[PDB]
C-alpha positions as semicolon CSV with decimal commas, in nm:
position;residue;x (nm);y (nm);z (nm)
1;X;-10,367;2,400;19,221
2;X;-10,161;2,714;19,173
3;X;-10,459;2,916;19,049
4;X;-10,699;2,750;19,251
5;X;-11,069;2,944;19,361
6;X;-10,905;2,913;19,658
7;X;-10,731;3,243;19,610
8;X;-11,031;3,431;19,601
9;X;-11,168;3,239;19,957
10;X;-10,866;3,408;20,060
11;X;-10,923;3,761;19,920
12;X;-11,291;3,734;20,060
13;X;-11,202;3,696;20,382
14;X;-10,910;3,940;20,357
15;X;-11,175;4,243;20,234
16;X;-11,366;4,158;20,519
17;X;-11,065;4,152;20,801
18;X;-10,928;4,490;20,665
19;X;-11,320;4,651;20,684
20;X;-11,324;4,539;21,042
21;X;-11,122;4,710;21,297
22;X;-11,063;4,621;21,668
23;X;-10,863;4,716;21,942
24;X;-10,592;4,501;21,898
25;X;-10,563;4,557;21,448
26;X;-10,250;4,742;21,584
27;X;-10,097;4,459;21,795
28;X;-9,789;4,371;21,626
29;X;-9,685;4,050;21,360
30;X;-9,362;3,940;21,272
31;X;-9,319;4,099;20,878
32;X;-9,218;3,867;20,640
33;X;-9,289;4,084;20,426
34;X;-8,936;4,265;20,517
35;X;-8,740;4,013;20,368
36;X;-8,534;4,124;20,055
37;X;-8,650;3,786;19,902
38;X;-8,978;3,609;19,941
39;X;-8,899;3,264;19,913
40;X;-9,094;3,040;19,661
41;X;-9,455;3,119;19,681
42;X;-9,581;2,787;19,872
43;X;-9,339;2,907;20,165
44;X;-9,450;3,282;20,191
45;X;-9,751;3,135;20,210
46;X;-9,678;2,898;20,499
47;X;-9,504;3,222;20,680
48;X;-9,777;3,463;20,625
49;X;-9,992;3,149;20,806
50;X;-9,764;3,064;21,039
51;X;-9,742;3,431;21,193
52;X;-10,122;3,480;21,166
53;X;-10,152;3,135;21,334
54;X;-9,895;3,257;21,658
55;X;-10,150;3,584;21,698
56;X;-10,507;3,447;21,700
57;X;-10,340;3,195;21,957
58;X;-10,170;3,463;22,147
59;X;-10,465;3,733;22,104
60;X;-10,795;3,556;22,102
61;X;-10,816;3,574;22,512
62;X;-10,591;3,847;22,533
63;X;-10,806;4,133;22,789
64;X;-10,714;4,354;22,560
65;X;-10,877;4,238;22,293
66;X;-11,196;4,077;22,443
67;X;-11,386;4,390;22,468
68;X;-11,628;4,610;22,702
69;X;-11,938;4,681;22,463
70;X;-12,127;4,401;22,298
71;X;-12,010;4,531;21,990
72;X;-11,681;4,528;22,048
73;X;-11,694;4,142;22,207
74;X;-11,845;4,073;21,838
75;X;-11,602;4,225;21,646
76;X;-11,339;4,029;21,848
77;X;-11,477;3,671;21,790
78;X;-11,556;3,818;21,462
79;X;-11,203;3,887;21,397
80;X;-11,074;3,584;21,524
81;X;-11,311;3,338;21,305
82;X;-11,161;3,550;21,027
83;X;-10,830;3,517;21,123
84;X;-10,892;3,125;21,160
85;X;-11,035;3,075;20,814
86;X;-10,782;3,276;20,617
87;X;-10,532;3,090;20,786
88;X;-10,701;2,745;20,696
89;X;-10,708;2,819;20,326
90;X;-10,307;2,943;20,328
91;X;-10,237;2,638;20,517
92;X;-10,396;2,427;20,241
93;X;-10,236;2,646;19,953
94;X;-9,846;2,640;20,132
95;X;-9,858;2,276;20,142
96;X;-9,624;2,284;20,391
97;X;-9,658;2,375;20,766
98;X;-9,248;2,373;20,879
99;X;-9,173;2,713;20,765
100;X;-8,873;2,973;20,929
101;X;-8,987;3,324;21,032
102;X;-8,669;3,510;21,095
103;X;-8,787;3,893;21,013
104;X;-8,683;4,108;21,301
105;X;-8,892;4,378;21,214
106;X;-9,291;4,396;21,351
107;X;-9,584;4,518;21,146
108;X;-9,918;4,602;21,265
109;X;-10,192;4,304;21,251
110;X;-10,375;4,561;20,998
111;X;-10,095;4,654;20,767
112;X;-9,971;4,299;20,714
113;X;-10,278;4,227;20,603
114;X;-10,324;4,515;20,365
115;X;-9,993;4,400;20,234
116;X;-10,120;4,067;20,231
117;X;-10,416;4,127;20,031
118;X;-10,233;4,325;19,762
119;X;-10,030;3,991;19,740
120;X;-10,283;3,765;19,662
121;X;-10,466;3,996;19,442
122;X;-10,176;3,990;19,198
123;X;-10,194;3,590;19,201
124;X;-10,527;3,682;19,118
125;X;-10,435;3,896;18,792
126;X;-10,172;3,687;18,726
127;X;-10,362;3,380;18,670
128;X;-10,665;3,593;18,503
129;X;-10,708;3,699;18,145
């Protein structure tokens, strides 16, 4: 389950989040990424979902995200259906969905999930040849 083909569902849909921008990439996330200790790897991933979860609810009517241009409405909706499946695969890999977020310090949407990515490509490697 650990080095499930799950991980690369995730990294899919990560590539294609972090070749997408909006207006809101730079809308802040809590970082729980800031913690001098990760946790065991089923509850980083139950954070990492859990704060992902908090802004596609908070940001997927949010005015100033929705969009002028048809493009940009796309993009949007685009981003959110992203945001939705990632966080429906890291829900399945934590295992667990009563997780504690208490990172004071806010990243950008866009470089939490650059960080993000980096992170589950190493599960990646590390379960590879």
């Amino acid at each position: 389950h650990k080095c499930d083909i799950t991980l690369q569902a995730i990294i899919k849909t990560l590539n294609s989040l972090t070749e997408q921008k909006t207006l809101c990439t730079e809308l802040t996330v809590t970082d729980i990424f800031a913690a001098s200790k990760n946790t065991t790897e089923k509850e980083t991933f139950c954070r990492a979902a859990t704060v992902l979860r908090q802004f596609y609810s908070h940001h997927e009517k949010d005015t100033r995200c929705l969009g002028a241009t048809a493009q940009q409405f796309h993009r949007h909706k685009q981003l959110i259906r992203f945001l939705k499946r990632l966080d429906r695969n890291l829900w399945g890999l934590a295992g667990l969905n009563s997780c504690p977020v208490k990172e004071a310090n806010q990243s950008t949407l866009e470089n939490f999930l650059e960080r993000l990515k980096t992170i589950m490509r190493e599960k990646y490697s590390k379960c590879s040849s």
